[PDB]
């Protein structure tokens, strides 16, 4: 029937893959008290409007134990915690013989 091929750019299809995500949050600590251990001095601001679409007719399968967003979460916090302690006072001199006593047994 001389069927010919035709191309379509923007087709709604996806395959399970895990890429690098990033941070989003609006006005939080700011001027009065800042220096949060997690949000750093700047996170990309979240849009005030959240976009949710109720995908119709679709029945995608999830997996929460084989999901990699939780593992990306884990290694981010560790690297985020260590970055918030690296530039500070090291207490190496605190290793001496300590002579200590109780307090008010009376």
């Amino acid at each position: 029937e001389n069927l010919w091929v035709t191309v379509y750019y923007g087709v709604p299809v996806w395959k399970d893959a895990e890429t690098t995500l990033f941070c989003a949050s609006d006005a939080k600590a700011y001027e009065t008290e800042k220096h949060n251990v997690w949000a750093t001095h700047a996170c990309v601001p979240t849009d005030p409007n959240p976009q949710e679409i109720h995908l119709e007719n679709v029945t995608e399968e999830f997996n929460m134990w084989k999901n990699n967003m939780v593992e990306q979460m884990h290694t981010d916090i560790i690297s985020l915690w260590d970055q918030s302690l690296k530039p500070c006072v090291k207490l190496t001199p605190l290793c001496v013989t300590l002579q200590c006593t109780n307090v008010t047994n009376n």
């Binding site: 010919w4 035709t6 379509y8 750019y9 399970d16 893959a17 890429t19 999830f62 929460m64 593992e71």
Partner: peptide
């Protein structure tokens, strides 16, 4: 473990890779 704590917040999410390229036949040239 600590990673399970975030799994209590991420049970419902999963990221996917969009592939915008699709080819299909039609009687059109």
């Amino acid at each position: 473990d600590m990673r399970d704590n975030w799994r209590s917040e991420l049970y419902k999410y999963k990221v996917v890779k969009i592939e915008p390229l699709g080819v299909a036949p039609t009687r059109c040239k």
